[PDB]
Amino acid sequence: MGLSDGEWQLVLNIWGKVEADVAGHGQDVLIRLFKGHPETLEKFDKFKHLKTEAEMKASEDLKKHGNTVLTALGGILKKKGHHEAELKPLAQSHATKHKIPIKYLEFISDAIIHVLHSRHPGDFGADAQGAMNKALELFRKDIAAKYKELGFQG
Ligand code: HEM
């Protein structure tokens, strides 16, 4: 499931563009997720009134959470697969506290890739698309393994 040095470079190069506006990207990611898959929004009680993209875009609380999400994922990707320590706390909370079905991680992955297409069409070429998909697939695999280790079957 691993990535070559080349594939990681493609990943970290496009990620570098995300780093110019982590909160903006994070915001757009959660908007895509919540609009494409409303069942995910149901996990955030404090966002229940947010129904339209405009309402979501206007929420600084949602933007702040977007920042929190991509900051954590950024820490993980920069480790190039060597992300045990970063994944431990995240699997623990998401498996045992928030109880986020593993499927929803695939949805947020899709949403991340969508935002990258939206914001960086010049720089997010097909090689970088393939590599990002691989990187997110590794992330999902490793966390899904932790979920089961923790007894979370959702
Ligand atoms: C790339 C995947 C994800 C990353 C990196 C991520 C990261 C985080 C982080 C860092 C936090 C705060 C610390 C913590 O509680 O662990 C958090 C909280 C949370 N996450 Fe995630 N998350 C991801 C996916 C998801 C998805 C897909 C959902 C729901 C469909 C979700 C639901 C939540 C909820 C409900 C909280 C608590 C929010 C609050 O009460 O303020 N997460 N996430």
Author numbering: 0 to 153
Original authors' sentences:
Hemoglobin (Hb) and myoglobin (Mb) are the key molecules in animal aerobic exercise, as they are responsible for molecular oxygen (O2) transport in the bloodstream and its storage in the skeletal muscle, respectively. In the present study, we investigated the molecular evolution of whale Mb by experimentally resurrecting ancient proteins. The analyses of their chemical properties and structures demonstrated how Mb molecules evolved to adapt ancient whales to deep-sea environments. The atomic structures of the synthesized aMbWp, aMbWb’, aMbWb, and swMb were determined by X-ray crystallography to 2.4, 1.6, 1.4, and 0.8 Å resolutions, respectively.
